[PDB]
Ligand binder design. Structure first.
Ligand SMILES: *[C@@H]1O[C@H](CO)[C@@H](O[C@@H]2O[C@H](CO)[C@@H](O)[C@H](O)[C@H]2NC(C)=O)[C@H](O)[C@H]1NC(C)=O
Ligand SMILES: *[C@@H]1O[C@H](CO)[C@@H](O)[C@H](O)[C@H]1NC(C)=O
Ligand SMILES: *[C@@H]1O[C@H](CO)[C@@H](O)[C@H](O)[C@H]1NC(C)=O
Ligand SMILES: *[C@@H]1O[C@H](CO)[C@@H](O)[C@H](O)[C@H]1NC(C)=O
Ligand SMILES: *[C@@H]1O[C@H](CO)[C@@H](O)[C@H](O)[C@H]1NC(C)=O
Ligand SMILES: *[C@@H]1O[C@H](CO)[C@@H](O)[C@H](O)[C@H]1NC(C)=O
Ligand SMILES: *[C@@H]1O[C@H](CO)[C@@H](O)[C@H](O)[C@H]1NC(C)=O
Lengths: 284, 118, 96, 357, 48, 48
């Protein structure tokens, strides 16, 4: 499979993400009641491994990352450069695996025995004849043999701008795998001008539930290569991406005392396990 | 109702135990009666509700705060009002009302106070 | 005058009465939370157990729930009596 | 326990409003689940790599399965076989495999055996029904059949609800085979001996395991039972998507997120529900819990008594007076105040005064 | 008991021990309250 | 700790029972607090 050249090797940048990605634990609605639910959560002030998908010089990295229960992905994008995800065990096209595209139509999904290349991506080119970004090489996979589940999510829209700028938006997701069900949670946050995860409290709202048996050891992310006229003009060297940044934090079983507002939005939550003080609150 | 719920099937199983249900109800009823008894003893020590004189000649003692106010509802004294403010059938469990209302208790307390000064 | 100020400023003076209010509220709450517990049964809700189980089999599950609920109530009544007796002593001291 | 009663108020016979009508609401899906197709299949996966199918979003009637009674064994755990239709479950699964009649007992919760502990082990908390029935004619041919295999050896016990499709030759300790498969070295697979000549006792049985979980999320594995028009503001029995509760139903103020399907109070009891067909949100309350207290002057004195319901709102009950303590009947109240002969609570006292009431 | 018995068989066995022991605690806790209440009345007399 | 003992398996069954485990501890603590109060009332009769 086609490769990419001149990558920069550096130790992983670290940051502290605090009180982020608390996701409505279940379906019940409750008003003005404090409830404690023993459901996997990102530990508060948990260590987060930051990542870079930015050229800056000759910098581009999107390697495989280990996956445990806590697969909290928090990308930050402006011109929508990070798009999809890959799940699975060994990505051998022999064990059942998960895969998505984030198109303007849907977060299109699939459960198929796909044969992925060593360097999958999404490709967009700037044409001189017409100012629109089209797919150039959608060779993410070879084929699919057996597919026990196929699926399309709810419709939404994406901007797809070809410019440079600070990340005007935020996207958080929590991937989980429990009792034969694959699940996902999301929120769009209009955070302004913060390099690190924003101070504050926001609660993820479940988007989709899929019943699947697939067992997945690790996962990968999809990038959008910003192919232009200035580039050499090939699949190995012809690319000038731009800014991308994404952070992955694992999830471990913890007990959260979650405050419920009158309407029911979880306005605030305190982690019992994390601090000596915090443990008192649960008992209290 | 609490132990077996609405279902009649479940209630029959409870009958085998026999005197448990009845015993529990009786004890709680007795406790409620006893609770009602306490208020009567503590507050109802006077046969007659004495009423304070209109005259304010109390030899320079101002009892306005302790005594009832005609402007405010329930005839509760200003000191009493503060105390009331500070303190702050769901599923087969019912909290019976007290035998004596809060307003009625205030009159007994007011009467004792009125009696003491006069 | 000072006493009026003291009463409006701190809740310490009315603390004892509230303990009674809170303690009673907590006792009632525990009994209600008791119903949710399975007590070794297949499911906590009584109706659910009856709906999905045939009468002989339904019997064992129903029994467990009855036994657990009886224990819950016993604790409350027993707990309540001790508190009632304690309050009774205070009233005897208090009336006098 | 006396034929004479002293003056006072006694509490007896607590009353709860009865449910006038029963309403059942189900999701409006008419596509029959294909249980039949799964039951009849040309090929059933062997124990080593059992076939599992997830059936959801459709309506299955279990009467035919229970009704048909053409199957040798129909063991059911945690669910009444007769009562299957009324219950509604989500996340139903199906397992397909064939094992001999002798080992049919082994495939059950908390049981031992070679295949159960080495090929497929049911969880202790399983709540599903297992079906077995011989297909001797299908498992008998001129040349025989040996594509059905069961594992003999494995280093460690197979986990519950997990399957082994891996193929690797058996080993114990040292003298590793590396494909050698002589003595102490074995191939993972082991075939069967299903033959027409072979006896019934060890003859092939076709076994399907039906497993489902309930009360987690809105699920659509609901039975064939027909729905009814919603009833509001009246105490009536109700069932929503396999969930049963009885209380007054009223339009609910509280807002609901798209993901949420249930509402709860401080005591973690059902407070609100959404009719699936309608899309509306409603509040459930118990009709009334009633303490009935009888007030009587005495048996010596009189044979007339006044009955009071503490919970009552004076309309709930199916002369009449309204008191803060409770709805009161059989007593005509008087404006002036008298010493309390009997204490009714909430500053009300009832006495016999005389012409006589 | 746990070493000797597997989880399906162990639950019923372990459950019996749990039930019995719970009774011992409740009886002890109930007894303490009764004694404590007696001491509290008693202590107040001493205080008085 | 008393009922279930050290073993984790024993603990799980106790969780099923409810807040009995938690409730019993609360009652004892209330009793423990009361002891201090009694002594305080009886002997702290003097400011200095
Ligand atoms: C899914 O596809 C795989 C191929 O990727 C199938 O595996 C083959 O199945 C045949 C028939 O049993 C065997 O002869 C081959 O040896 C298998 N492949 C290999 C590489 O060994 C598999 O059967 C398919 N499964 C389903 C459920 O359709
Ligand atoms: C995060 O990881 C680093 C290692 O790079 C470590 O030194 C640090 O202790 C971790 N931070 C926290 C808050 O645990
Ligand atoms: C999941 O995948 C790993 C290899 O990544 C394998 O060892 C493991 O047994 C798999 N388990 C299940 C239980 O599906
Ligand atoms: C959500 O809560 C707010 C603040 O309590 C209150 O106005 C209302 O209950 C809800 N309102 C809106 C309007 O979003
Ligand atoms: C009693 O106190 C009140 C409140 O301070 C005051 O208004 C009143 O003048 C005082 N005394 C008399 C005799 O009015
Ligand atoms: C079935 O349910 C949907 C969604 O609630 C509704 O739009 C539709 O009209 C229903 N159909 C009938 C025929 O009852
Ligand atoms: C029930 O509620 C109140 C209670 O005082 C009052 O409006 C009346 O007694 C009843 N009213 C109804 C049911 O509209």
């Amino acid at each position: 499979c086609v490769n990419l050249t001149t990558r920069t090797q550096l130790p992983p940048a670290y940051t502290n993400s605090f009180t982020r990605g608390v996701y409505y634990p279940d379906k019940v609605f409750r008003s003005s009641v404090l409830h404690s639910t023993q459901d996997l959560f990102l530990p508060f002030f948990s260590n987060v491994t930051w990542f870079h998908a930015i050229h800056v010089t000759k910098r581009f990295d999107n390697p495989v990352l280990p996956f445990n229960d806590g697969v909290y992905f928090a990308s930050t994008e402006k011109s929508n450069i990070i798009r999809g995800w890959i799940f699975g065990t060994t990505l051998d096209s022999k064990t059942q695996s998960l895969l998505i595209v984030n198109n303007a139509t849907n977060v299109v999904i699939k459960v198929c025995e796909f044969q992925f290349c060593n360097d999958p991506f999404l490709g967009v080119y700037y044409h001189k004849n017409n100012k629109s970004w089209m797919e150039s090489e959608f060779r993410v996979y070879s084929s699919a043999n057996n597919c026990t589940f196929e699926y399309v999510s709810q419709p939404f829209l994406m901007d797809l701008e070809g410019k440079q700028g600070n990340f005007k938006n935020l996207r958080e997701f929590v991937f989980k795998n429990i009792d034969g069900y694959f699940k996902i949670y999301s929120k769009h946050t209009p955070i302004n001008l913060v390099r690190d995860l924003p101070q504050g409290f926001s609660v993820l709202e479940p988007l989709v539930d899929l019943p699947i048996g697939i067992n997945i050891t690790r996962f990968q992310t999809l990038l959008a290569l910003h192919r232009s006229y200035l580039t050499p003009g090939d699949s190995s060297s012809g690319w000038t991406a731009g800014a991308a940044a994404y952070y992955v934090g694992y999830l471990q079983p913890r007990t959260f005392l979650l405050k419920y507002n009158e309407n029911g939005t979880i306005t605030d939550a305190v982690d019992c396990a994390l601090d000596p003080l915090s443990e008192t609150k649960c008992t209290l | 109702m609490y132990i077996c719920g609405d279902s009649t099937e479940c209630s029959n199983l409870l009958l085998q135990y026999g005197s448990f249900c009845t015993q529990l109800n009786r004890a709680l009823t007795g406790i409620a009666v006893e609770q009602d008894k306490n208020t009567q003893e503590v507050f109802a020590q006077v046969k007659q509700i004495y009423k304070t004189p209109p005259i304010k000649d109390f030899g320079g003692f101002n009892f306005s705060q302790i005594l009832p106010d005609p402007s405010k509802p329930s005839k509760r004294s200003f000191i009493e009002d503060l105390l009331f403010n500070k303190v702050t059938k769901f599923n087969g469990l019912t909290v019976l009302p007290p035998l004596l209302t809060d307003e009625m208790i205030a009159q007994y307390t007011s009467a004792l106070l009125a009696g003491t000064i006069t | 005058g000072k006493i009026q100020d003291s009463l409006s400023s701190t809740a310490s003076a009315l603390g004892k009465l509230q303990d009674v209010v809170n303690q009673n509220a907590q006792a009632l709450n525990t009994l209600v939370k008791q119903l949710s517990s399975n007590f070794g049964a297949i499911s906590s809700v009584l109706n659910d157990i009856l709906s999905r189980l045939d009468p002989p089999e339904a019997e064992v599950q129903i029994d467990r729930l009855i036994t657990g609920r009886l224990q819950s109530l016993q604790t409350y009544v027993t707990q309540q009596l001790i508190r009632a007796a304690e309050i009774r002593a205070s009233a005897n001291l208090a009336a006098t | 326990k006396s034929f004479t009663v002293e003056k006072g108020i006694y509490q007896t016979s607590n009353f709860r409003v009865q449910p006038t009508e029963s309403i059942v609401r189900f999701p409006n899906i008419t596509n029959l689940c294909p249980f039949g197709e799964v039951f009849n299949a040309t090929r059933f996966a062997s124990v080593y790599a059992w076939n599992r199918k997830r059936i959801s979003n459709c309506v299955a009637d279990y009467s035919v399965l229970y009704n048909s009674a053409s199957f040798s064994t129909f063991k059911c755990y945690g669910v009444s076989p007769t009562k299957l239709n009324d219950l509604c479950f989500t996340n139903v699964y199906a397992d397909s495999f064939v094992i001999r009649g002798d080992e049919v007992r082994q495939i059950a919760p908390g049981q031992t055996g070679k295949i159960a502990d080495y090929n497929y082990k049911l969880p202790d908390d399983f709540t599903g029904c297992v079906i077995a029935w011989n297909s001797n004619n299908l498992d008998s041919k001129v040349g025989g059949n040996y594509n059905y295999l069961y594992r003999l050896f494995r280093k460690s016990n197979l986990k519950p609800f997990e399957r082994d499709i891996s193929t690797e030759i058996y080993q114990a300790g040292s003298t590793p085979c590396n494909g050698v498969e002589g003595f102490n070295c074995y191939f993972p697979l082991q075939s069967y001996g299903f033959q027409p000549t072979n006896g019934v006792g060890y003859q092939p049985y076709r076994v399907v395991v039906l497993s489902f979980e309930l009360l987690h999320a809105p699920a659509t594995v609901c039975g064939p039972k027909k729905s009814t028009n919603l009833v509001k503001n009246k105490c009536v029995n109700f069932n929503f998507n396999g969930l049963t509760g009885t209380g007054v139903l009223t339009e609910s103020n509280k807002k609901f997120l798209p993901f949420q399907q249930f509402g709860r109070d401080i005591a973690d009891t059902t407070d609100a529900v959404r009719d699936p067909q309608t899309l509306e949100i409603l509040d459930i309350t118990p009709c009334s819990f009633g303490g009935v207290s009888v007030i009587t002057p005495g048996t010596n004195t009189s044979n007339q008594v006044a009955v009071l319901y503490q919970g009552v709102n004076c309309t709930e009950v199916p002369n009449v007076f309204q008191t803060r303590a409770g709805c009161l009947i059989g007593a005509e109240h008087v404006n002036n105040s008298y010493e309390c002969d009997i204490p009714i609570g909430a500053g009300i006292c009832a006495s016999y005064q005389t012409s006589q009431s």
